[PDB]
RNA sequence: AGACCAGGC
DNA sequence: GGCAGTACTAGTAAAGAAAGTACTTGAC
DNA sequence: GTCAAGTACTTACGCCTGGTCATTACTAGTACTGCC
């Protein structure tokens, strides 16, 4: 018998929440959108070099998260941000896959990143 | 990175809430729930900034290149 | 000679080795993310004499991988079924076991020697 | 391009030659001698690969013109090669040249008179005497005396017929050239070629040439000539052959047979006269490139030579070589013995070096890229840098929504407004707005960047200062001080402003749809484009991170194409079908919905709010300058507006008064039973302009045929139906952010009798898996799972391919059941909230977003997950998955799953539901290469086919593909309500004010085409009861006799017919023949335009579609494969439908079906037992069959022709493999005295055969047959049982040829079919008591074309490219088919879209630009052909106008002086 | 994005007294449509929308390793029953209110925080301009590359898309 | 300008 | 003091898992 | 003349953005130094 059936799927694959309520290739995008966020590569960029680095400024924990994550130390690396998101048919902008963000919540550093 | 200035939706001063939360939570031996209400966070917009913290800024700290080590 | 099969890929070898690929062995580590940063250490590879190819049931997903390959972390588009990563807990044997007490207790379980 | 600098020639024709080593020495520089390329400090050494006489290099004037970098064209200058080489181009046309040619007299090994016969038929095919070579051959040991008078008689027949052609008006002294004589010229030159090649004697002095041979390249070796035929050298009274004598050869035999080669190396008659010369094949001089075109590889400090460069000083370092080989044969036996052994050695390297210049393959050496291969493929020079090329003026970022933006025009970035400049020339009404364009500089709205002078001279404004800039501007409109440039005008590059217009392009551009036209609308803000969502649908363009492109144009001939031709409101109609593509697409339909509800109502503050948040007049979508509403519904107690009457008034204002409001009845996609009971919703209702009924959807605005939007388009005009988009796009937008539409957690959850619904239907699929299986392995009734009989068949299952797809399509048909009773049930009866405010439910209804499969799995169930076809894929050992046990007969272990994505699924369902997730990425991803080169073929071969002013559609060499569009000429996007008859009648008053009868009849013929019309409908009706071959038809249709565009009452006969019977149906102030002079004035305007690319529109209508399938008969894709690309005779799957008479029944048709479908000899053997004894091998063949009541029933093979095919089939097979095999190693039963009979049928066998020593049949019961077999003690061991396998596999017992099986399927929609699985029409001609056989149709496209004809095959290729895109329902028009088959059967063959299917072409740059270019290059220099440049793609090549749409004519000016 | 796979670019920062406002007082900072969730079905960001918010409110994290629920034990009950003991909706839905026109909406608007992730494409990578500028030294054509001021290609199936409208002044 | 690698739709 | 050995230097020379037709060579 | 099979050349979705690395051996020569 195996230990826990989430020991088949792989590091990205744990890290994505109910990840058995969503259809099979949305789960595959966000292991693959996963690693490309603007998150923190590192703590050390004083001391290094690299051509080209992204940083997001201030990052959050999840409050949705699998016991994995804690256990890998991705608070050490944060790659996001929790937002109060609403599903509504508001605004006419937001249709095919587009999105709004509040002017004001950005005008105070939400998402921000160099 | 450090605590944030004035939470992202409403606009509540939050800034000043992260070292009494941490006050709050090992002196007085509280839970986050009771923490949150005590420093006068009630809208879950403002709870999820004190909550969900990384406080990553101490760990950007140990890399002094100005002094001796 | 070790610097440049580092810094290129490319297999330079006179008494070619029993690879079919002769490129494309090394792969920069990004440190974009540490969600990309972690997922170059446990990808695998088929080759890229498979990439190249026309057919489709190299790039399947077979029942044999339950708990070895992960399901769902693999790329979309050119590189899907064919890159693709281990399930966290799988781990890969790095040296020779113990051996030598094993036909010792074997020939005292039935097997007549060879 | 300046429009002011206008430019006098034009390139008509080019034509294709080789350079002769006497011109590239009048024509060269300097001739550049040695191999080194630059010396120190940098300086090109004179007499080097860089020269200052052919061209500046690198801040040093050039020697030849004493120009700069920036104006020296280049020079091209030669090199000298002391011996003639090949070219390697033509080595393969030198070879067969260089073979079949006599080394002693210098003819060809033909006989004189039959060479002769060539050249004179060769000759009437440079002229338009395709029919008269054929005639020539009427004109017909053997003494000279008539062979000289035959030669007379020949060539005075071809005198006489070319001076009769040329003064009977067919032929041009320049010579009639067309695809099907180029036909007939590829035919005769092939049969000459390989005519000379097998021959064995020159038949003009009797003895033998010793033959070559070719090592490969570089080389050419003569063979010995054996001792038997030297003797016919000597009664007529290995070697590596130089290249110099290989053309002393040659230049022999092309002046004995000067008069033939004329005619094989032109094409057009030779009007130059010139003689075809042996050096014309060699090369004794390259020419080496200009300086410009070989520059070297310049990075930093990284300074490479280029890469022609190093090949060039190889050639050179051999030539000094050569040059210091014969300074010693000056100087002259140990000295010769050696020099010229290494002499010969540098004839083979200078070979090798001009081998790798022009082509790196042919080169014997990671190699560096030849001359032919900078040009063949992707990445070459015709498709990377002709066919496709990087252009100015033009900007690529990504798109987000913009609403308030009215649906023709783009949102442009601030930063795109500054860059991306016009010029506008200088005139008396632009210094207005024009002074201060270049006021405000390059950096301020709306600016101006550069000024052009008079002179050419150009003026940046980005270094200067507001005061010179105010000078510049007074400056601006001057008379010129200067005579030579006195009518000419300064021209400002303003900045693109809110009237200039913009294409747009997003990739891939699939279809013409997806690259329109739009206008600009600046926005202030932000970097990224900004399109409104009624153009998602054409370009496939989603917001998740689309950048898509933007080209500006830069004169007014191409803004008025954009504007009007190209442009996005032209657009409505895709010409695929003739539905929609353009229209709103989700929040607005699921707004729709809601508005136009019964619940839906509006006090006065509200609806006047809304309809002046959709109008606002002052920006012109009204049409009255006065918002008009309408009295409210309820008056009493307060005044309330339904929202039916919002988009009753919004209709109002929008369309134009004085004009009746739109008649409409339509339906919609929600059926009455959502709303409730006797609801009238369903069906919609605009009378008078006023939605009186039902919901307005995605069926009645959106991409869908039939609604409200596409009957504004058609009563209204294109031009109305785009703003109701913009206003109803504003109107759903402001009811939205008034009153909102969300979706939820709430949305997605079933009853608590729901859920008992759904658990209950699914208890039932928990032995489904295992019946399944027991019908499957024929296990009895009710057997238990772990049966050991079940689970022994079952294993035997799994090992073969085929019965485990049987096994995976009986058990996926019985859980697609129990999925279907879930649904059926648990929705919409079961659901938590109901419709309308179940949102989830509601937007999938509606067609917002979503379908009903979708809620299905999110609220019920999952369902099968499927692979390709079957199940998901089991292991060896027989588990389909390490959780399940081996060979479970489980629904759930299978694949099917049972949970949804609401609760959950389980991990054994979640890992089978990533077999399924993947699987469609892979077929998304790698297999639209496949879909994307199907296209590719069809556009290069139908680029050129257009419409001509004959309503004629025709290829741009001017050869005819039809003779009409589609046998009508009639346009796909304007036949959409041409039969829709109670709609324009009900719209009779609003469509005459489009039409216009009375204003157009005096431009017109009404008189005449109507008469015609009524002699042939009034004919027809009279006969057809009798088929069409019997029809003496006495009157062609009216379409063909008339010209439609032009005379009234040219109609299909279909519409004619359609006409009269709705005009008969229902008899109804417009009176009848009011109706039908209003819909032949609506036909002749549905024409088709001449101009029109149709063969474009026709090959972008099925590869546009072939990806809608991506992104026991073949389907899809690879049958689009075989017709249309490969076009196979060899075809994969060939099948034939036998119609049954309606006499014979179902039980005399499967008792047929025997007798058709082929029995083996494999197929009635149970065993076969070989003995073989040794110490003479005896081999004892005892095959065992079954018994005679178990073959003789299911086969119908008797007893005796059983005996026959053992004694005359088997045996003749059997025999002949074993002799085979031998060559290849040199490197119970009663006695035998039942009868005579057998003794005698014994005997015959020993006799006839070869080593049958005794043979004996069961005569009594024909279960076992014996054969003794033997041989010597010489041979070794054959293994006599693979032998006797692969022997009964191809013994045949009863076969009709080509034909391996015959089907009766269920009788498909009422005619009885009985499908044949292979094609044979000659034997099934025989079968007229079973068959009919004037409707025996097939699937063969090439066995219908030998047997049946060319249209027969025309007929049936439309029919096989039909029901590939029926599979699916995607309806493509017949139109496209129809050209498609056209263009296919043109030659009165079946020919492909490949490079063998286009060989019959006059364009050469057509050929050369698709693929293997340097072969149709050799091919077109070696005719000499010269083409026309008709062809869109020989046009851009060489830079001229497109024959096609706006090209297609010129524009005179009409000036009034004399 | 989120952690669903749920992508797509930004549209207009929507001011904040243009957005929609609940009766606690908050405003959404993300708005997704409702749309971009039947045709995916991302059913898992449904439950991160009410596992984030009772969370949020009680201040506990809630682990969400896949199979911690049955089919007897949805989330939609366990997350539903937590938002009922702050006082908020079970179904995870708020009151909200328009903010151009003030009105109460028709629904109880589903509302909750999710975590989203900031990808790495932003536009400024994207967006290049060109009117004109550097040419290849062969052909005279425009440099490939955005880095190097180049052109963008108008290749072989752009070029018959314009034959295809009959637009040939387009074409040259 | 190439080759390889990593990506976007 | 000048001779010859090495260690360098800059100098110019070599670098194994797709499906279609057309063709010659090939026995008979 | 002949069918025959082996062999040889030929294509295999569109556009876009980054990043890296890139000739090696050797051979003869001028100069450095250890030496007697
Ligand atoms: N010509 C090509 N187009 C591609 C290729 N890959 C992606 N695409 C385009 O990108 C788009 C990819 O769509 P998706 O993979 O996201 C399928 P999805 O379920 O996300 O569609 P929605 O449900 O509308 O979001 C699709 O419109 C294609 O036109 C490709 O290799 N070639
Ligand atoms: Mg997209
Ligand atoms: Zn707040
Ligand atoms: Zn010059
Ligand atoms: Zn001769």
Not at chain 4, 130 to 149: A, F, M, Q
Not at chain 4, 1144 to 1162: N, P, W
Not at chain 4, 1426 to 1435: G, K, T, V
Request: proline fraction near 4%; glycine fraction near 6%.
């Amino acid at each position: 018998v195996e230990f826990t059936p989430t020991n088949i799927l792989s590091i990205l694959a744990n890290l994505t929440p109910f990840s058995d309520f969503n259809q099979s290739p949305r789960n595959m995008y966000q292991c693959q959108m996963g690693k490309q966020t603007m998150g923190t590569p590192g703590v050390a960029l004083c001391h290094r070099s690299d051509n080209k680095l992204y940083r997001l400024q201030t990052g959050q924990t999840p409050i949705v998260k699998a016991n994995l994550y804690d256990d890998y130390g991705m608070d050490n690396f944060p790659n996001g941000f929790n937002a109060v998101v609403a599903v509504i048919s508001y605004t006419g902008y937001d249709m095919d896959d587009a999105m709004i963000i509040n002017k004001s919540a950005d005008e105070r550093g939400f998402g921000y990143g160099t | 990175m450090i605590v944030p200035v004035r939470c992202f939706s409403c606009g509540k001063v939050v800034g000043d809430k992260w070292e009494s939360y941490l006050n709050l939570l090992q002196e007085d031996e509280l839970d986050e729930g009771t923490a949150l209400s005590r420093l006068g966070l009630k809208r879950y917009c403002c709870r999820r900034m004190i909550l969900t913290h990384v406080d990553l800024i101490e760990k950007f700290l140990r890399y002094n290149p100005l002094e001796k080590r | 000679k070790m610097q440049y099969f580092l810094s290129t890929g490319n297999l330079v070898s006179q008494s070619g080795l029993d690879l079919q690929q002769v490129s494309g062995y090394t792969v920069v580590a990004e440190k974009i993310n540490f969600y990309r940063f972690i997922s170059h250490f446990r990808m695998v590879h088929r080759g890229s004499f498979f990439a190249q190819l026309k057919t489709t049931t190299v790039r399947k997903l077979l029942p044999e991988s339950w708990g070895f390959l992960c399901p769902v972390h693999t790329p979309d588009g050119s590189p899907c079924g064919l890159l693709n990563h281990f399930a966290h807990k799988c781990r890969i044997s790095t040296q020779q076991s113990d051996v030598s007490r094993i036909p010792s207790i074997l020939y005292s379980l039935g097997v007549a020697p060879a | 391009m300046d429009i002011s600098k206008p430019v006098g020639s034009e390139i008509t024709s080019v034509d294709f030659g080789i350079l002769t080593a006497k011109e590239i020495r009048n024509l060269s520089a300097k001739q550049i001698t040695n191999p080194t390329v630059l010396d120190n400090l940098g300086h090109p050494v004179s007499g080097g690969l860089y020269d200052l006489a052919l061209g500046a290099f690198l801040r040093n004037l050039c020697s030849t013109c004493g120009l700069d970098e920036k104006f020296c064209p280049g020079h091209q200058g030669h090199i000298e090669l002391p011996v003639p080489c090949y070219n390697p181009l033509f080595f393969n046309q030198l070879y067969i040249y260089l073979r079949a040619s006599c080394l002693f007299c210098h003819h060809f090994r033909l006989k004189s008179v039959e060479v002769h016969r060539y050249a004179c038929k060769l000759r009437l095919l440079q002229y338009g005497l395709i029919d008269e070579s054929y005639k020539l051959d009427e004109i017909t040991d053997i003494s000279s005396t008539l062979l000289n008078e035959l030669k007379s008689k020949r060539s005075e027949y071809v005198d006489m017929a070319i001076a009769k052609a040329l003064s009977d008006g067919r032929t041009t002294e320049r010579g009639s050239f067309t695809a099907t004589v180029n036909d007939e010229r590829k035919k005769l030159v092939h049969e000459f070629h390989k005519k000379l090649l097998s021959r064995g004697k020159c038949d003009n002095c009797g003895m033998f040439s010793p033959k070559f041979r070719k090592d490969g390249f570089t080389k050419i070796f003569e063979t010995a000539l054996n001792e038997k035929q030297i003797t016919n050298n000597r009664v007529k009274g290995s070697t590596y052959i130089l290249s110099t004598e290989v053309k002393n050869i040659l230049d022999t035999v092309f002046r004995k047979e000067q008069c033939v080669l004329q005619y094989v190396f032109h094409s057009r008659p030779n009007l130059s006269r010139k003689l075809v010369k042996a050096d014309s094949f060699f090369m004794d001089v390259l020419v080496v490139p200009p300086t410009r075109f070989r520059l070297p590889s310049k990075l930093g400090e990284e300074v490479h030579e280029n890469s022609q460069n190093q090949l060039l000083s190889k050639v050179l370092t051999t030539s000094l070589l050569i040059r210091d080989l014969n300074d010693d044969l000056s100087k002259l036996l140990e000295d010769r013995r050696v020099i010229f052994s290494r002499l010969m050695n540098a004839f083979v390297t200078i070979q090798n070096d001009v081998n790798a210049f022009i082509d790196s393959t042919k080169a014997q050496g990671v190699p560096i890229p030849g001359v032919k291969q900078a040009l063949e493929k992707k990445e070459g020079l015709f498709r990377k840098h002709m066919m496709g090329k990087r252009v100015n003026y033009a900007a690529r970022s990504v798109i987000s929504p913009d609403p308030n933006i009215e649906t023709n025009e783009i949102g442009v970035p601030p930063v795109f407004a500054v860059k991306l400049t016009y010029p506008e020339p200088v005139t008396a009404y632009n210094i207005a707005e024009l002074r201060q364009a270049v006021i405000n500089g390059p950096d301020k709205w709306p600016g101006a960047t550069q000024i052009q002078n008079e002179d050419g001279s150009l003026v940046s404004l980005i270094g200067m200062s507001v005061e010179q800039r105010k000078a510049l501007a007074n400056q601006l409109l001057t008379p010129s001080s200067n005579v030579s440039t006195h009518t000419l005008n300064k021209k400002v590059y303003r900045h693109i402003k809110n009237r200039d217009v913009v294409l747009m392009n997003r990739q891939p551009t699939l279809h013409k749809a997806s690259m329109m036209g739009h206008k600009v609308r600046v926005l202030p803000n932000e970097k990224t484009l900004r399109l409104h969502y009624a153009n998602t649908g054409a370009y496939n363009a989603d917001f998740d991170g689309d950048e898509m492109n933007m080209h500006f144009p830069q004169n007014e001939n191409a803004r008025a194409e954009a504007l009007n031709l190209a442009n996005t409101d032209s657009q409505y109609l895709t010409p695929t079908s003739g539905s929609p593509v353009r229209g709103l697409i989700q929040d607005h339909i699921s707004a729709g919905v809601w508005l136009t509800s019964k619940d839906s109502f509006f006090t006065r503050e509200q609806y006047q709010q809304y309809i002046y948040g959709c109008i606002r007049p002052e920006d012109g979508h009204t049409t009255r300058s006065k918002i008009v509403t309408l009295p409210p519904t309820i008056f009493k107690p307060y005044p309330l507006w339904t929202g039916k009457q919002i988009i009753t008034t919004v209709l109002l204002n929008v369309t134009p008064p004085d004009m009746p409001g739109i008649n409409l009845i339509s339906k919609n996609k929600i059926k009455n039973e959502y709303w409730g009971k006797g609801s009238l919703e369903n069906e919609v209702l605009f009378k008078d302009g006023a939605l009186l009924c039902g919901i307005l959807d995605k069926s009645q605005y959106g991409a869908s045929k039939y609604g409200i939007v596409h009957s504004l388009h058609e009563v209204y005009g294109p031009e109305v139906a785009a703003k109701v988009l913009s206003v109803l796009g504003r109107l759903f937008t402001n009811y939205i952010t008034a009153t909102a539409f969300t979706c939820g957690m709430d949305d997605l959850r079933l009853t608590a009798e729901g859920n008992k619904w759904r658990t209950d239907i699914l208890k039932t699929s928990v032995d489904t898996g295992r019946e399944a299986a027991a019908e499957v392995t024929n296990l009895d009734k009710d057997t238990p799972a772990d049966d050991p009989e079940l689970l022994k068949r079952l294993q035997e299952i799994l090992r073969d391919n085929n019965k485990s797809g049987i096994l995976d399509a009986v058990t996926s048909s019985k859980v697609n059941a129990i999925t279907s009773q879930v649904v059926s049930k648990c929705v919409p009866d079961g659901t938590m909230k109901k419709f309308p405010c179940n949102s989830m439910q509601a937007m999938a209804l509606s067609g917002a977003k979503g379908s009903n499969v979708n809620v299905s799995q999110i609220m019920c169930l999952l369902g099968q997950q499927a692979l390709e076809g079957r199940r998901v894929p089991v292991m060896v050992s027989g588990k389909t998955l390490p959780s399940f046990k081996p060979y479970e007969t489980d629904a759930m272990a299978g694949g099917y799953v049972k949970g949804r994505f609401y609760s959950g699924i389980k991990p054994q369902e979640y890992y089978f539901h990533c077999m399924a997730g993947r699987e469609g990425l892979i077929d998304t991803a790698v297999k639209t290469s496949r879909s994307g080169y199907l296209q590719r073929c069809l556009t290069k071969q139908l680029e050129g086919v257009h419409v001509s002013y004959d309503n004629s559609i025709r290829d741009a060499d001017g050869t005819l593909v039809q003779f009409m569009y589609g046998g009508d000429a009639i346009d796909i996007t304007k036949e959409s309500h041409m039969t829709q008859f109670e709609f324009c009648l009900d719209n009779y008053y609003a469509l005459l004010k489009k039409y216009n009868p009375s204003a157009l009849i005096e431009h017109l013929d009404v008189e005449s085409a109507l008469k015609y019309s009524k002699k042939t409908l009034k004919y027809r009706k009279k006969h057809s009861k009798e088929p069409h071959y019997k029809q003496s038809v006495k009157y062609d249709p009216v379409l063909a006799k008339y010209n439609p565009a032009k005379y009234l009452g040219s109609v299909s006969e279909n519409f004619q017919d359609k006409l009269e019977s709705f005009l008969d149906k229902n008899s109804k102030g417009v009176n009848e023949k009011k109706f039908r002079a209003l819909m032949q004035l609506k036909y002749m305007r549905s024409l088709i335009n001449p101009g029109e690319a149709v063969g474009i529109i026709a090959s972008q209508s099925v590869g546009e579609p072939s990806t809608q399938m991506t992104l026991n008969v073949t389907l899809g894709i690879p049958r689009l494969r075989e017709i249309v690309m490969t076009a196979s005779a060899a075809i994969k799957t060939p099948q034939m439908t036998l119609p049954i008479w309606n006499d014979v029944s179902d039980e005399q048709a499967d008792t047929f079906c025997k007798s058709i479908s082929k029995v083996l000899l494999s197929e009635v053997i149970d065993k076969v037992i070989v003995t073989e004894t040794t110490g003479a091998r005896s081999y004892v063949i005892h095959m065992r069959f079954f018994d005679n009541n178990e073959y003789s029933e299911e086969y119908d093979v008797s007893k005796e022709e059983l005996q026959n095919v053992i004694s005359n089939q088997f045996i003749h097979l059997l025999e002949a493999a074993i002799v085979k095999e031998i060559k290849k190693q040199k490197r119970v039963e009663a006695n035998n005295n039942m009868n005579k009979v057998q003794r005698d049928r014994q005997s015959a066998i020993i006799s006839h055969h070869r080593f049958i020593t005794k043979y004996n049949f069961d005569d009594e019961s024909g279960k076992w047959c014996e054969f003794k077999l033997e041989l010597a003690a010489d041979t070794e061991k054959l293994l006599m049982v693979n032998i006797v396998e692969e022997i009964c596999r191809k013994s045949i017992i009863r076969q009709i040829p080509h034909i391996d099986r015959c089907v009766h399927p269920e009788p498909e929609n009422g005619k009885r079919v009985l499908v044949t699985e292979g094609v044979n029409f000659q034997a099934m001609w025989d079968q007229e008591a079973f068959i009919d056989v004037d409707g025996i149709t097939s699937n063969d496209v090439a066995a219908v074309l030998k047997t049946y004809g060319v249209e027969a095959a025309r007929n049936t290729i439309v029919n096989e490219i039909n029901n590939v895109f029926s599979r699916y329902a995607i309806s493509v028009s017949f139109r496209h088919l129809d050209l498609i088959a056209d263009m296919m059967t043109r030659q009165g063959t079946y020919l492909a879209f490949n490079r063998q299917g286009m060989e019959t072409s006059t364009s050469s740059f057509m050929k050369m630009s698709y693929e293997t270019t340097c072969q149709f290059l050799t091919k077109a220099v070696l005719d000499n052909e010269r083409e026309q440049l008709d062809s869109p793609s020989a046009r851009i090549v060489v830079g001229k106008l497109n024959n096609v749409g706006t090209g297609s004519f010129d524009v005179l000016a009409k000036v009034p002086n004399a | 994005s989120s952690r669903h796979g749920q992508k797509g670019v930004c549209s207009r920062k929507w001011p904040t007294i243009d957005m929609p406002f609940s009766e606690t007082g908050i405003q959404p900072d993300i708005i997704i449509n409702p749309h971009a969730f039947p045709s995916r079905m991302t059913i898992g960001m449904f439950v991160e929308s009410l596992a984030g918010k009772a969370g949020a409110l009680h201040g506990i994290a809630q682990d969400s390793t896949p199979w911690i629920f049955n089919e007897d034990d949805t989330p939609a009950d366990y997350f539903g029953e937590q938002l009922a003991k702050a006082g908020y909706n079970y179904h995870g839905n708020e009151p909200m209110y328009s903010g151009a026109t003030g009105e109460e909406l028709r629904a109880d608007i589903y509302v909750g925080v999710v975590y989203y992730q900031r990808l790495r494409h932003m536009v400024n990578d994207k967006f290049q301009v060109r009117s004109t500028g550097p040419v290849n030294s062969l052909t005279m054509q425009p440099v490939k590359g955005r880095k190097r001021h180049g052109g963008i290609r108008v290749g072989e199936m752009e070029r018959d898309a314009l034959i295809g409208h009959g637009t040939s002044f387009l074409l040259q």
